[PDB]
């Protein structure tokens, strides 16, 4: 499980997600929604 | 010279002074007939010497001497292969 | 771990370090001061030098010439090479060039010594070094002189000669100037590297050049093997120079800091000496005299040219011409101009709006600076008498400076101003001593002084420091200045010429990479801290180690716990024998036995094979591998 | 452990290049271009995708600009100043020098030739330039503690660079735009064997090689001579900083034969600035110029004109070089709209004309247009789309991919019809994955980062001391003090609970024979079939291979059958196990 602990350590220290990626569907997002 | 080089290498300090003397000796050429005695002395001091740089310089010098004129090096390859095995 | 130092000259080092699996050459360097023992090469055969009286000894006479007591050699100047025979240069894998000053002697190493490795340097360094070898070969081969002088090199003859000729060392190793074919061949074996560029050498070590701030393309090198780092600090400057300042930060965490290229004449402040040089030439020009400034075509000439451009306008000397005579003059000016991105933030900001970085383009535009390739061309038509001339080699042994010294040397009005400190201005001036010319020594060395290097050392904190032995003692001229020393908390070991230093930086724990496939099968434990066991196959490629997927044990098993816990874990009919400092347990099935020693255990089987594996596994309940 | 790439611009189009890369939690912007042809609200990339109404500096730690073209750096001032990104922006020195003037020219166009209600100003352009950090060629800068980027040579324009983005073992290479065939003033692109996890390449030209260099120059000059033979004028537009220099020098050398001046209608200030920038950045140019600039200055053009006058002059052989390229707006459209003729109004397009009106229809007849008071042309009127843009073709793209040797490839800055063909070619030829992301599509890849570990020198040397010629490496890894340090068992003991476990079993031998048979004959059972066991000879008589000893004592000390001590450890368990097995009952009388 040596590949488990280091991967968990790396993933634990990460940064905020993009809003579009959170709102994406099928890994694709509509751009310029206001138009 | 043979005896002069022998006594100079004996009296010189092992790490640096012997290296400097070998450096000086390598420049000047050696007559073909006298090659056997000087390489024998160099081999003896190679056995005595513990420093790696001095032994490296002795190897380089006694390889240089084998290119001197029509000297026949077939008499100095058994000791050479021996010290190579022991190195 | 090792360091072969092939040159005793401090500012022209040649060091090879047999560190890890590669032997890296740090700089080449060419001790040009040997030329001062020879008679100068004039552009036109002078009557004074030709008719010099030969020196007398009991024996020869035509080889040596005497001028005002000093004894010289009537032969082509020769250059003291680094020690090439100490270490077979065929084994050298890489050469790192820091400065164009240290770039010389490279043709010797690359051509004559059977070197088949690689050379790494920055592009301005390569171009300016090319210019320097161009002008050196041009000067030497312009009016060739024979090499008839060989008797004075004899060991028993050199002792009786006077001091400048007697104290010369490694005289038998001196060589004449390399030909231009060798220069072109050598520069073809070069790889251009930018600052902070990580160059991998056979997957073993990584070298990066770091800006030193001393010259255009000047670089310090750091060699590292991912655990042990060796920093090479060549000529560097922390002043307000044109190149981007020293990258001092990258030198931190250095096991060994080999330190060369420190300033000569440490007592001199370069700004004050620049001011003194300008004032002296202004005074000479105002009285109608000429000024001669022996200098390299691309070194400190630019800085003093800028200061002169600023000074003449206030001094009211715009009328006088500024001549710059060298075969590589226009090439020097153009190369200085185009390397704008190799400058500091103040001067590289001139690339945003359209403007050349250096101001001597304005000197040319207003026809203040006039550069020529030689004396015989348009210079002899445009020559005006109250002038200032930058030309020739600073050694005063070849180039147009010889002609100008022979021309203007008879009058007290003219002056010669020395700005390069690498040549003893009394010794370079020796073949012309009975002149009436006003000789001024105001060297301009922007390199690190001992206060600056002390501050840098305290900032960086290297574990061990390597420097020439000249810096571990005060200079002989002073001999009492403890401030002109390298003071370190470690003793700061030193070297002389042809000395081999066994560095103590030998360390274990080389890096290795483990792939996810094997890391999946590796599981850790707990001890007293985490620990695991690895059994795998080692794959090495290009000195990079990879762990591919295909005695000791530790724990807490005291005699009490041994007797109690595993008493009835599956077997029966077990007796305990009252042995000292432990207990002996054996079973009656086939006299199978278990014996424990202090902090140790082992299992005995007697005519039984099937139960032995389970016997071992029972003890492995709480036995790790720490 | 994933690399997530979301091109929200130039996904399946050319223009508005802006690619987001999340590699190890480090979110980098790969370009900040703008689109040409779009009137409003689509010129700039969609920055609402990055959690609008918030601070972009928190999300992005690095912004990279490939070169100074507007489809790669045009939206930079709007992005930075307006949306509030105060982080670093990386771009090469010529890119830094030439970027603000292009923005100033487009700002002039927007405030004069169009509306400027939602555009930026010169002061706001200068504000953006403050955050810029110049990066030299192959300068491995450390933008963050673990994130580092390296600029390579692209050869598209002066200062164009391919930016590697290496963090840990994971690395991403973004080529922006590039040309593998050197120009008359720019070299060829080069990149070492980076072998990254992903390689993002432009694909504006997935077509075959464009008939070398000499043939294209010959055809272009032949067309120029044909147009001017009948006294017609030529109206080639160009951005005045890219292929303008090559066309200028080529046409000047062609005019060395007849020696009639040619008007360069890019602004005299802009022409002087271009010459100065090209002479200050000689290292970025070709070795052709790098070696011959001292001998002569090729940029000192002997033919030039200022502006409006000779355009409305008599129908002569004058060839105009319009200041704005792509025929989207400006002097180019102003001249083109007022020009017509069989030999005259020769319109040669070196650029691509991605979506701009008028220019884009090179593949069409160029006689239809869409404008008020539109004009018509004739067949002799040049509408030739000469392939003079500094873009790598399909052969160049395959060459670059084979040179870098990436784990995966991604395509941007091209057309979908060309990019699908290029993807098919890459997958069928090099057996390497390729991707086809659209604008706003998120492409995610898995990573396999190796574990950085330190192995002791002694164990490493002993690895090949006995494993040089069937081998194995056994050791213990100590994850102590939050670092991984692989060592042998002895150094594991030395680190810091010791309790050794061994096997030294005394199997009651079934063989009942003489003392000599029991002691001096049994112990020679190693060399029968067993392997991977070291050999050391001793006169006395014993088998000492690692933790193995068999000559124990007298043959029968215990009052029973013969007793002999068999000893082994877990690494050499095979020999001891086989010996104990065949000594329990396998040696009968
Ligand atoms: Zn583009
Ligand atoms: Zn482009």
Swiss-Prot record, chain A:
Modification Phosphoserine occurs at: 24
Tissue: Widely expressed. Tends to be up-regulated in seminomas compared to normal testis.
Positions of region (Cleavage module binding motif (CMBM)): 1-35
Localization (cell): Nucleus; Cytoplasm
Job description of the protein: Component of the integrator complex, a multiprotein complex that terminates RNA polymerase II (Pol II) transcription in the promoter-proximal region of genes.
Assembly behavior: Component of the Integrator complex, composed of core subunits INTS1, INTS2, INTS3, INTS4, INTS5, INTS6, INTS7, INTS8, INTS9/RC74, INTS10, INTS11/CPSF3L, INTS12, INTS13, INTS14 and INTS15. The core complex associates with protein phosphatase 2A subunits PPP2CA and PPP2R1A, to form the Integrator-PP2A (INTAC) complex. INTS13 is part of the tail subcomplex, composed of INTS10, INTS13, INTS14 and INTS15. Interacts with transcription factors ZNF609 and ZNF655. Interacts with PAFAH1B1; this interaction may be required for proper recruitment of dynein complexes to the nuclear envelope at prophase.
Domain notes for this protein: The cleavage module binding motif (CMBM) mediates recruitment of transcription factors.
Family from the record: Belongs to the Integrator subunit 13 family.
UniProt name for this protein: Integrator complex subunit 13
Organism: Homo sapiens (Human)
From-to range in the entire protein, with total length: 655 to 689 of 706
UniProtKB/Swiss-Prot annotation, chain B:
HEAT repeat feature ranges: 32-71
Localisation per UniProt entry: Nucleus; Cytoplasm
Transmembrane segments: none
Physiological role: Component of the integrator complex, a multiprotein complex that terminates RNA polymerase II (Pol II) transcription in the promoter-proximal region of genes.
Quaternary state and interactors: Component of the Integrator complex, composed of core subunits INTS1, INTS2, INTS3, INTS4, INTS5, INTS6, INTS7, INTS8, INTS9/RC74, INTS10, INTS11/CPSF3L, INTS12, INTS13, INTS14 and INTS15. The core complex associates with protein phosphatase 2A subunits PPP2CA and PPP2R1A, to form the Integrator-PP2A (INTAC) complex. INTS4 is part of the RNA endonuclease subcomplex, composed of INTS4, INTS9, INTS11 and inositol hexakisphosphate (InsP6). Interacts with BRAT1; interaction is required for the assembly of the RNA endonuclease subcomplex.
Family affiliation: Belongs to the Integrator subunit 4 family.
Protein name, UniProt field: Integrator complex subunit 4
Lineage: Eukaryota, Metazoa, Chordata, Craniata, Vertebrata
Name of the gene encoding the protein in the UniProt record: INTS4
Portion of the parent chain present: 35 to 121 of 963
Curated annotation (Swiss-Prot), chain C:
Cross-link Glycyl lysine isopeptide (Lys-Gly) (interchain with G-Cter in SUMO2) mapped to chain: 58
Annotated localization: Nucleus; Cytoplasm
Effect of residue 612 to E: Abolished interaction with INTS11
UniProt xrefs under Gene3D superfamilies: 3.40.50.10890, Ribonuclease Z/Hydroxyacylglutathione hydrolase-like
Keyword annotations: Cytoplasm, Isopeptide bond, Nucleus, Ubl conjugation
InterPro entries: Beta_Casp, Integrator_9su, IntS9-like_C, Metallo-B-lactamas, RibonucZ/Hydroxyglut_hydro
Pfam family for this entry, one: IntS9_C
Domain of life per record: Eukaryota
GO BP annotation list: negative regulation of transforming growth factor beta receptor signaling pathway; regulation of transcription elongation by RNA polymerase II; RNA polymerase II transcription initiation surveillance; snRNA 3'-end processing; snRNA processing
Effect recorded for residue 279 to R: Decreased interaction with INTS11 and BRAT1
SMART domains linked: Beta-Casp
Amino acids binding 1D-myo-inositol hexakisphosphate: 2, 19, 506-507
Any single Gene Ontology cellular-component annotation: nucleoplasm
Membership in a protein family: Belongs to the metallo-beta-lactamase superfamily. RNA-metabolizing metallo-beta-lactamase-like family. INTS9 subfamily.
Chain's role: Component of the integrator complex, a multiprotein complex that terminates RNA polymerase II (Pol II) transcription in the promoter-proximal region of genes.
General remark: Although strongly related to RNA-specific endonuclease proteins, it lacks the HXHXDH motif that binds zinc and participates in the catalytic center. Its function as endonuclease is therefore unsure.
Protein's recorded name: Integrator complex subunit 9
Organism the protein comes from: Homo sapiens (Human)
Name of the coding gene: INTS9
Swiss-Prot record, chain D:
UniProt-reported outcome of changing residue 461 to E: Decreased processing activity of the Integrator complex
Binding site for Zn(2+) 2: 71-72, 177, 413
Effect of residue 413 to Y: In NEDMLOB; uncertain significance; may affect function; the orthologous mutation in Ints11-null Drosophila is unable to rescue larvae lethality
Required cofactor names: Zn(2+)
CDD domains: INTS11-like_MBL-fold
Position of the Glycyl lysine isopeptide (Lys-Gly) (interchain with G-Cter in SUMO) cross-link: 380, 461
Outcome of mutating residue 209 to E: Decreased nuclear localization of BRAT1
Consequence of substituting residue 395 to E: In NEDMLOB; uncertain significance; may affect function; the orthologous mutation in Ints11-deficient Drosophila is unable to rescue locomotor defects
Documented effect of changing residue 137 to F: In NEDMLOB; uncertain significance; may affect function; the orthologous mutation in Ints11-deficient Drosophila is unable to rescue locomotor defects
Top-level taxon: Eukaryota
Sequence motif HXHXDH motif, residues: 67-72
EC number: 3.1.27.-
Entry coiled-coil feature ranges: none
Localization terms from the record: Nucleus; Cytoplasm
Activity control: The RNA endonuclease activity is inhibited by BRAT1 that forms hyrogen bond and hydrophobic interactions with the active site.
Record note on what altering residue 216 to W does: In NEDMLOB; uncertain significance
Family matches, as InterPro entries: Beta_Casp, INTS11-like_MBL-fold, IntS11_C, MBL, Metallo-B-lactamas, RibonucZ/Hydroxyglut_hydro, RMMBL
Phenotype when changing residue 54 to S: In NEDMLOB; uncertain significance; may affect function; the orthologous mutation in Ints11-deficient Drosophila is unable to rescue locomotor defects
Positions annotated to bind Zn(2+) 1: 67, 69, 156, 177
Effect on the protein upon substituting residue 16 to L: In NEDMLOB; uncertain significance; may affect function; orthologous mutation in Ints11-null Drosophila is unable to rescue larvae lethality
Name of the molecule in the record: Integrator complex subunit 11
